[PDB]
């Protein structure tokens, strides 16, 4: 779909999920936008190391 979905300035309306605490089961969908703690610390608020 390089004729329908690509833009000369880049199209960024399409996303994937890069992080998750667990792999999802067959035909599941995850709408969550919770922040992913990759470190051993917890974190609170919108972003962190």
């Amino acid at each position: 779909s390089n004729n329908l979905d690509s833009k000369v300035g880049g199209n960024y309306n399409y996303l994937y999920r890069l992080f998750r605490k667990s792999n999802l089961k067959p035909f599941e969908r995850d709408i969550s936008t919770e922040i992913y703690q990759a470190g051993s610390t917890p974190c609170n608020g919108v972003e962190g190391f």
Partner: antibody, heavy 124, light 107 residues
């Protein structure tokens, strides 16, 4: 049989507010964007507003920011624009129109069908 | 902002005569331009999208061409139903509209 209907004529003072409705029918309202446009008498088309009937995500032309509110009623298949602190040149024909369901590009806005038009009048 | 300039204020032409209407942009829109008509006292109607593709159920004697900065809308013959006002709209950043070329019959 896609039919797009709007509220009738409105008579308003300068500095006041006006709410114009956009009743969808013949298709699933949550399937595509609704765009708002307005044509002043003897003038060119003027876009200002777009609102995703599924998400409620909303965006504007810069000169209408803080003046126009766009909203939607998925239960009643109806979009609305609500316009505040009405200027004398807010006197225009206003339209809602629909973004493309079929064989376009994924960004493109378009106006495949337009409502009956609402003739809002602002005067002292 | 992205300015749509459009050069004819109004056009006078006869039945069977060719019409070309020009729209142009401040920078490369690449392909991201749509064309419409409005008939007198009635709402707008889409004719060409993606600077080239003809709308469903509209007669083949409408045409569209051009890319990058500049875009041309074309009619082979302005039969009296085509009379009205013609608008281009870009989509590279927000919808923005051209001037509004009127059609007039050459009598």
């Amino acid at each position: 049989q896609v039919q797009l209907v709007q509220s009738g004529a409105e008579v308003k003072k300068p500095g006041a507010s006006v709410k114009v409705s956009c009743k969808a029918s013949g298709y699933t309202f949550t399937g595509t964007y609704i765009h708002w446009v307005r044509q002043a008498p003897g003038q060119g088309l003027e876009w200002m507003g777009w609102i995703n009937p599924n998400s409620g995500g909303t965006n504007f032309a810069q000169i209408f920011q803080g003046r126009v509110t766009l909203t939607r009623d998925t239960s009643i298949s109806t979009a609305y624009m609500d316009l505040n602190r009405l200027k004398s040149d807010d006197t225009a024909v206003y339209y809602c129109a629909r973004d493309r369901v079929l064989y376009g590009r994924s960004f493109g806005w378009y106006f495949d069908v337009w409502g009956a038009g609402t003739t809002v009048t602002v005067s002292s | 902002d992205i300015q749509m300039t459009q050069s004819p204020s109004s056009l006078s032409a006869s039945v069977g005569d060719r019409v070309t209407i020009t729209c142009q942009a401040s920078q490369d829109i690449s392909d991201y331009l749509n064309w419409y008509q409005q008939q007198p006292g009635k709402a707008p109607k889409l004719l060409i999208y993606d600077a080239s593709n003809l709308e469903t159920g509209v007669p083949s004697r409408f045409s569209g061409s051009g890319s990058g900065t500049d875009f041309t809308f074309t009619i082979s013959s302005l039969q009296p139903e085509d009379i009205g006002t013609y608008y281009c709209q870009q989509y590279d950043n927000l919808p923005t509209f051209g001037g509004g070329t009127k059609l007039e019959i050459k009598r």
